[PDB]
Ligand SMILES: N#Cc1cccnc1N1CCN(C(=O)[C@H]2C[C@@H](c3ccccc3)CN2)CC1
């Protein structure tokens with residue numbers, strides 16, 4: 269099984285601003301770690317192209333993309349009304365190179381999708397992607413351009429049915445919304461729910477019109493652990509595969525669902541998270557693996573390094589190799605992480621009752 273992987277050496281140089289939790293540097297740390305494990309010997313590594321306005325407007329509105337192409341720190345005063353309209357300037361800040369960042373993020377995802385469509389690879393990886401909150405005409409949740417939606421649109425040229433799976437701790441609302449009224453994409457999100465960003469992803473949100481029953485949401489509480497997550501992920505995705513029979517899969521691998529994350533409150537290890545990748549691989553479908561959140565950046569590097577190894581069917585040692593960020597991995601300098609003692613608020617009965625409701629909804633498919 270062939271793996272192609274996208275990385276631009278400048279991606280880690282884009283900076284959201286002092287105090288902003290989103291740190292693109294984590295992608296560079298990921299790259300450096302997997303280079304030092306030698307995983308480059310086993311996969312094709314490509315620099316993404318800069319996605320064009322033409323590519324982005326396959327989903328996004330022309331006026332929103334023109335604005336993103338225009339806005340800079342130095343001209344914000346002139347654009348204050350557009351900033352309000354497009355939701356840029358606070359949680360989605362204006363920063364130097366914002367548009368180029370969007371171009372490289374998106375380029376990796378669309379390029380991966382083209383490679384899968386051309387049957388030139390079995391798996392494509394873009395850790396700079398996964399920006400699941402961006403909306404047709406507005407930024408949201410640190411996300412400006414929805415690389416995932418654009419990648420899925422590319423797959424839909426060749427594939428009648430595309431499955432999207434999202435294991436970020438946040439609901440993938442921008443992706444769900446884009447495809448909410450179609451049966452040609454089934455969206456499956458596992459996420460923290462209960463007055464938590466973005467507020468959507470209720471398990472009663474099942475899609476609308478032709479898309480009714482083609483959106484699947486598994487709302488979870490704080491503290492979910494590897495065993496609990498594993499016992500619902502494999503059965504739900506197995507049932508989705510049996511009922512939906514997709515011909516391509518997109519997996520958002522947001523790492524803010526790991527134990528110890530600065531913003532998230534789940535308790536997964538890197539092994540528990542990566543088990544999701546292993547499960548999806550067993551179906552032998554063309555697979556686009558994307559990044560996502562993650563705010564404890566040493567753990568993001570560990571998670572995506574290990575998930576790359578999983579894609580390559582390669583075990584790698586727990587002892588970390590020397591690397592340019594080695595001091596970030598103290599005090600233990602291991603790849604794998606331990607869970608915390610936080611309480612798991614997801615009772616066995618809760619997990620099984622929700623799974624049973626999702627099974628009933630999946631049985632509604634043709
Ligand atoms: N704005 C906000 C906000 C407000 C209040 C409370 N929380 C807020 N945040 C919490 C953190 N968020 C995420 O982790 C999202 C972002 C997404 C991403 C992936 C790759 C690159 C860039 C972004 C992954 N999931 C966004 C929303």
Ligand SMILES: [Ca+2]
Nearest residue numbers: 434436438458
């Ligand atoms: Ca999710």
Ligand code: NA
Nearest residue numbers: 447450453482
């Ligand atoms: Na749908």
Ligand SMILES: [Zn+2]
Nearest residue numbers: 436438524561
């Ligand atoms: Zn997130």
